[PDB]
Amino acid sequence: PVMHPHGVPPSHRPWQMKDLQAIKQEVSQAAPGSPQFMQTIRLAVQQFDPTAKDLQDLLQYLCSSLVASLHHQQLDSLISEAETRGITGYNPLAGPLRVQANNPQQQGLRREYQQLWLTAFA
């Protein structure tokens, strides 16, 4: 997660097993793949403002590795298309999008990545 205490720079913190278990419980109260599921997963994304790596690690904890693997591959295709049109604050010369989306200071890029990560659940 990315924390934003007012008056200081943002910072990344590792997932805590408690945070993961809390999200697992919230998401479990909605049918996997449903709109309320998507509403609960997006709700979790806004709560913890996770990086690209955080989102990958989160999915690997909540889902089977095969379900998580499919999402990763569908997101890879969405990332390719997004990179062809251009992404908010993304410069290909600065490295992979997934790597740039782990810089806590690149909020706009992280927030756009999150939307792509949520869209890949289609």
Annotate 26-49 with DSSP letters as a single string. HHHTS-TTSHHHHHHHHHHHHHH-
Provide the greatest CA pair distance for the chain.
Answer: 42
**In a 3-state reduction of DSSP, which class is residue 12?**
strand
Residue-range domain boundaries for the chain: 15-119
Rounded CA separation 108/91 (Å): 13
Token pair listed for 84: 């062809």
Q: Which residues does the chain break after (C to N > 2.5 Å)?
A: none
Q: Which CATH architecture has domain 15-119?
A: Orthogonal Bundle (1.10)
> Residue 11: phi, psi to the nearest 5?
-145, 155
| Residue pair 1/12 in contact by the 8 Å Cβ criterion | yes
Closest of 95, 119, 97 to residue 109, by C-alpha: 97
State how far the alpha carbon of 21 is from the alpha carbons of 35, 57, 99, 120, in Å. 21, 13, 26, 23
Count CA within 13 A, CB hemisphere, residue 61.
18
> Residue 6: phi, psi to the nearest 5?
-65, 130
Residue with tokens 């599921």: 37
Residue with tokens 């990763």: 72
> Residue 14: phi, psi to the nearest 5?
-65, 155
> Which residues are CB-neighbours of 20 under 8 A, at least 6 positions away?
58, 61, 62
- Provide DSSP, 65-83: HHHHHHHHHHHHHHHHHHH
